[PDB]
Design a protein around this ligand. Structure first.
Ligand SMILES: CC(=O)N[C@@H]1[C@@H](O)[C@H](O[C@@H]2O[C@H](CO)[C@@H](O[C@H]3O[C@H](CO)[C@@H](O[C@@H]4O[C@H](CO)[C@@H](O[C@@H]5O[C@H](CO)[C@@H](O[C@@H]6O[C@H](CO)[C@@H](O)[C@H](O)[C@H]6NC(C)=O)[C@H](O)[C@H]5NC(C)=O)[C@H](O)[C@H]4NC(C)=O)[C@H](O)[C@H]3NC(C)=O)[C@H](O)[C@H]2NC(C)=O)[C@@H](CO)O[C@@H]1O
Ligand SMILES: *[C@@H]1O[C@H](CO)[C@@H](O[C@H]2O[C@H](CO)[C@@H](O[C@@H]3O[C@H](CO)[C@@H](O[C@@H]4O[C@H](CO)[C@@H](O)[C@H](O)[C@@H]4O)[C@H](O)[C@@H]3O)[C@H](O)[C@H]2NC(C)=O)[C@H](O)[C@H]1NC(C)=O
Length: 361
């Protein structure tokens, strides 16, 4: 089983305990650690933060303590304009330019692979996405001839039915990619005036209608479309999405005024880190959708949809039962990495819970 974990570039800037640097990562926790995100300048991959080469270096030293650990650099991300990927990929010339610039960059900074996070490809992009993947892999195969271990190519893919149908030729890119990370956690939060969980495992017979917005459907779909199970990796969130209630109602379908109040450390309306959620639970009412098998909490007028050790162990069992390649976690720096916010003294409680199930039979 693979355990793919993302570490974000911008987490170093959070104040106090929220600050997270690469050396806080347990080397033996995941099998693959992906650094987010790289930029693209002059059609070449490039750094993003002023100190990335130092952090790249700190992250890759982890391999001195654990030789089996693989690291990858991810390009793209939500805040990355998909138009930019679109323009680079639709022109054979700028596409070859970006592709050719990737291996030397990865080899200089000690990475073992590239992760593609184009979010998201439209109907007019499908054909070019397939090309970027093909040519990128061909180039990695070419590059291994020099006697080095071949570079890995992976991609983070939307788990939304319409998004998949619209921009991805799953059967094609599946044969060229080493693994595919299913983003099974942004199903409900897309500013949509009402309450709901963003990462349910199952559909649940109540208020069913977007029968497609749950992990079980997304996995089943990807498999029907042609992706091999041994290359699929299910995404497991380490954060929660919050809402500000518009009334005293707390059950499903309850109206919402907008996103939740920022977290003290993450300072971003709408989301909370697992460690902030831990603090938040004191004096809150915790509920759990049986059908969807995920929890939520309320306090005053705030409503939070999140994942705990139990829902995360549950998802890991599901994933083993369908024989997938493993799990993907977003993100290490949103988990209780210091291990001093959630109680039972454990560093990375959520990710460790996923690791324990995977390590079981
Ligand atoms: C919200 C929503 O609806 N979107 C979701 C998507 O998120 C989702 O995408 C996938 O799933 C992840 C979670 O859903 C998703 O989220 C993450 O993506 C973006 C980036 O792509 C993250 O954006 C953060 O936002 C930060 C602000 O909150 C911002 O922080 C600022 O960062 C800069 C530098 O990075 C700091 O500047 C530096 O400051 C110091 C001094 O302070 C100086 O010394 C430096 O020189 C400064 N200069 C610079 C520029 O370096 C600044 O301090 C800091 N603070 C501020 C002002 O707040 C980050 O920069 C920015 N990151 C980027 C790259 O833009 C989101 O926060 C992430 N969300 C969560 C949650 O973590 C991923 O993109 C994606 N994952 C995968 C697998 O790819 C999609 C579904 O895919 O669904 C929705 O669209
Ligand atoms: C990620 O890579 C991106 C490049 O592909 C890059 O985004 C930008 O990259 C350039 C660097 O800033 C931008 O260039 C500038 O654009 C402005 C026009 O608005 C021009 O005029 C001015 O320049 C003045 C100083 O010289 C400044 O005071 C003014 O405010 C004004 O900006 C500049 O001369 C310059 O050309 C690119 O336009 C932009 N790329 C795209 C496609 O939009 C990011 O910088 C890079 N790293 C990150 C985001 O961390």
């Amino acid at each position: 089983y693979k355990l793919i974990c993302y570490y974000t570039s911008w987490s170093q800037y959070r104040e106090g305990d929220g600050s997270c640097f690469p050396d806080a990562i347990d080397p033996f926790l995941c099998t693959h650690v992906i650094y987010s995100f790289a930029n693209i300048s002059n059609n070449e991959i490039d750094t993003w933060e002023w100190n990335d080469v130092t952090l790249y270096d700190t992250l890759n030293t982890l391999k001195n303590r654990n030789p089996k650990l693989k690291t990858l650099l991810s390009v793209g991300g939500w805040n990355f304009g998909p138009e930019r990927f679109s323009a680079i990929a639709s022109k054979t010339q700028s596409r070859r330019t970006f592709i050719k610039s990737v291996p030397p960059f990865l080899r200089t900074h000690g990475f073992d692979g590239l992760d593609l996070a184009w979010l998201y490809p439209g109907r007019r992009d499908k054909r070019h996405l397939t090309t970027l993947v093909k040519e990128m892999k061909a180039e990695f195969i070419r590059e291994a001839q020099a006697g080095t271990e071949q570079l890995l190519l992976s991609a983070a893919v939307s788990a939304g039915k319409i998004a998949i149908d619209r921009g991805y030729d799953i059967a094609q890119i599946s044969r060229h990619l080493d693994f595919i990370s299913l983003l099974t956690y942004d199903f409900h939060g897309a500013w949509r005036q009402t309450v709901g969980h963003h990462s349910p495992l199952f559909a649940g017979n109540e208020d069913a209608s977007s029968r497609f917005s749950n992990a079980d459907y997304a996995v089943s779909y990807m498999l029907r479309l042609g992706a091999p199970a041994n290359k699929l990796v299910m995404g497991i969130p380490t954060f929660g999405r919050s809402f500000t209630l518009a009334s005293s109602k707390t059950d499903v379908g309850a109206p919402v005024s907008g996103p939740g109040v920022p977290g003290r450390f993450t300072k971003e309306k709408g989301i909370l880190a697992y460690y902030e959620i831990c603090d938040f639970l004191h004096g809150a009412t915790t509920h759990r959708f049986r059908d969807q098998q995920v929890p939520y909490a309320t306090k005053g007028n705030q409503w939070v949809a999140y994942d705990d050790q139990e829902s995360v162990k549950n998802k890991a069992r599901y994933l083993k039962n369908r024989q997938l390649a493993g799990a993907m976690v977003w993100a290490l720096d949103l988990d209780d990495f210091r291990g001093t916010f959630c109680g039972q003294n454990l560093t990375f409680p959520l990710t460790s819970a996923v690791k324990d199930v995977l390590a079981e039979v």
